[PDB]
Paper text:
First, the aaRS combines the specific amino acid with adenosine-5′-triphosphate (ATP) to produce an activated aminoacyl-adenylate intermediate which reacts with the appropriate tRNA to produce the aminoacylated tRNA. In general, aaRSs are divided into two classes based on the global fold and sequence conservation. Crystal structures were determined for a CysRS from Borrelia burgdorferi bound to AMP, GluRS from Borrelia burgdorferi and Burkholderia thailandensis bound to glutamic acid, a TrpRS from the eukaryotic pathogen Encephalitozoon cuniculi bound to tryptophan, a HisRS from Burkholderia thailandensis bound to histidine, and a LysRS from Burkholderia thailandensis bound to lysine.
We solved a 2.6 Å resolution crystal structure of TrpRS, a class 1c aaRS, from the eukaryotic pathogen E. cuniculi with its cognate amino acid L-tryptophan. The E. cuniculi TrpRS structure was solved during the second round of crystallization trials for this target, as detailed above. For example, in the E. cuniculi TrpRS crystal structure the three residues that make hydrogen bonds with the cognate amino acid, Glu124, Gln119, and Tyr84, overlay almost exactly with the human structures homologous residues. Differences, especially just outside the aminoacyl binding pocket, need to be taken advantage of when trying to gain selectivity with a molecular probe compound or potential lead compound.
Author numbering:
A (entry chain B): 24 to 266, 274 to 297, 312 to 383
B (entry chain A): 19 to 302, 310 to 385
The structure:
Amino acid sequence: DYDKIINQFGCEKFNQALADRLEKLSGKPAHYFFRRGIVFAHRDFNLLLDEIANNRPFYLYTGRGPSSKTMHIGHTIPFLLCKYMQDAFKIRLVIQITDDEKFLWKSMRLEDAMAYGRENIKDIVTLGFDPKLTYIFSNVEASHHFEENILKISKTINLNEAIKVFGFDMSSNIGQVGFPAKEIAPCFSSSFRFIGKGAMCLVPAAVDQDPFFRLARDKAKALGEKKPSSIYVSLLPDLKGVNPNSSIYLDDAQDTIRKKIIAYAYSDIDVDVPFEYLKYFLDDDQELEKYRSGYIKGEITSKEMKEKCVVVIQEFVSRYQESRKRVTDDDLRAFIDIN
Amino acid sequence: VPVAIDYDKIINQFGCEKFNQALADRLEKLSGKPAHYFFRRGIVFAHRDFNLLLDEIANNRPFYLYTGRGPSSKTMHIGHTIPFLLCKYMQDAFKIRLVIQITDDEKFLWKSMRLEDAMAYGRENIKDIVTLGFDPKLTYIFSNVEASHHFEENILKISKTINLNEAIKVFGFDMSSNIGQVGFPAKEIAPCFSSSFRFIGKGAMCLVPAAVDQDPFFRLARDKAKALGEKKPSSIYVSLLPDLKGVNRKMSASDPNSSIYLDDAQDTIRKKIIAYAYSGGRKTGGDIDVDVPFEYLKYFLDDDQELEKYRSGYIKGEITSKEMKEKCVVVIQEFVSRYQESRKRVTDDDLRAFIDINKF
Ligand SMILES: N[C@@H](Cc1c[nH]c2ccccc12)C(=O)O
Ligand SMILES: N[C@@H](Cc1c[nH]c2ccccc12)C(=O)O
Ligand SMILES: [K+]
Ligand SMILES: [K+]
């Protein structure tokens, strides 16, 4: 229930007026995420759209927390949204890899969290962001470049707030408690040398990242910075239709994919996982529409739905692996270089 | 109580060991050279595991010193020089490394200050410290803001081992504390571990000369040593020089008029001491135990026999309070003057050598 999720976090409901505006402003149709309700919520997107209308530049900011097995396809969603956004407005993108957060939260040696951090970057670079417009960084290694901001953010946030907003308690470690300043800092242009002096930030994130951003927004004025704007993506469910072997991984083979879908995909179009997967990955609106119409009229079977989902997901992973196989460890360096 | 302090109540309220003359003797044998007068005159009163640091030395194992200063807007008073003098000595006696954390972060995080200022003040305090004349080849002085990231791993590892329950019980944090403050003790703890500095031997033991008010950081550091696979730091504690009325053995300054500052003119030093220094003298021997001028000498008179001569003479009424004050004036005066002429000669080249982690 998406209205209840919006109510709990207290952000705004996304709407199609905002998609039209974005389409109008980009001279190209809004990415289908905005059209299919995958982007369902926001804070101040209108204001970021106003920034584009006034031909002022904005920049994107998103993050990823390590915890490596291979990444699955659900993990690509905000990053795809950033790719489209970068390619539409040829704008800069900063990606935070939270090796520190994963270390501080999970039972994990730091070297491993950092090691997973690097693979996640290789995996993320795969989606083909512009190296001249994208800065991806490890927190452990590189959040000190905006140390001043971290301190400044940290000073404005008392434990009272930290607890209420994040649910810390007497057993939270003092790293966890300090960490939100490191997630908030990249929300401000002053955090990066390579970004214009008062560029607005746009933060595409799982809705569940919101508290960082309501908070960042509350402290912006006190810090003399522009309020970031944010947009939220629904989370792709696993194939059973929920949140192990029923996720679709980025290193799954073509046959592994056809297996997982035929076996586990729950098959009434509001409950149908194969359609839902299609909502997220099938490029063609006229095509997707055929299947929504088709299943609804009973002119298409669950067998056919599964199988169209199969080939679409197969087209996606195959594109991904074709690029992945070619990401050299040299290529990784262009993205993490600050200088 | 002007000079006299119940050192044992201070030692018990913290959980540390008391210093003894056995440890100074051990220090003499091991360095060949005599033990710094700090160790002989009661100024090093408490410690944790100094016997073990001595055992490291005796075992041809290296150690390093670590100490700190939070920068302030204000000129620091001569009291502030005490643990840094102890380091200068320890460094020269063992030709060992020293790391000095300037906590511009802490001062920013705790005070009503722009970060820019804390950092500026930090940079002045590095000039202030270098003045005391350390070995450029063995001393790393750094700002936390610029430089603590070279040990962000240790900060992160340390941060994992300290929960809020503990952070509060130990440091007195509350709901109105900011989250920078709460995380800060990991940053003070980190330099206790040789791995926090690339240029120090794999597992060299740390020795922290400190005000006892700093113990909680080190008790905690020692508690997390095993957790981190690191050697427990040793710690020795200095009794703080009192103000001229005695009493305020705070690193913080009470009534400026009753403290001697590193920028006081010679006549101010005389005026201040003669006017406000509380004396042991009787109405009409002398009461050494409360005599503030003698206490100052205990801290600053680099000559043992001359100290003994004033002590003796005082106890048997052979020396007057005016005379004790007088000698106290000359000693403080010379110390401040040598300090000030040294400050002038400190170039930025001097400074840049102390500041650069690449030197080692
Ligand atoms: N903490 C997030 C990662 C992250 C950091 N910064 C972000 C900004 C936007 C979205 C996500 C992030 C996670 O565990 O996944
Ligand atoms: N909290 C200390 C600063 C400090 C950091 N590390 C230290 C090590 C030793 C002594 C003091 C310090 C102070 O303001 O005094
Ligand atoms: K900037
Ligand atoms: K080391």
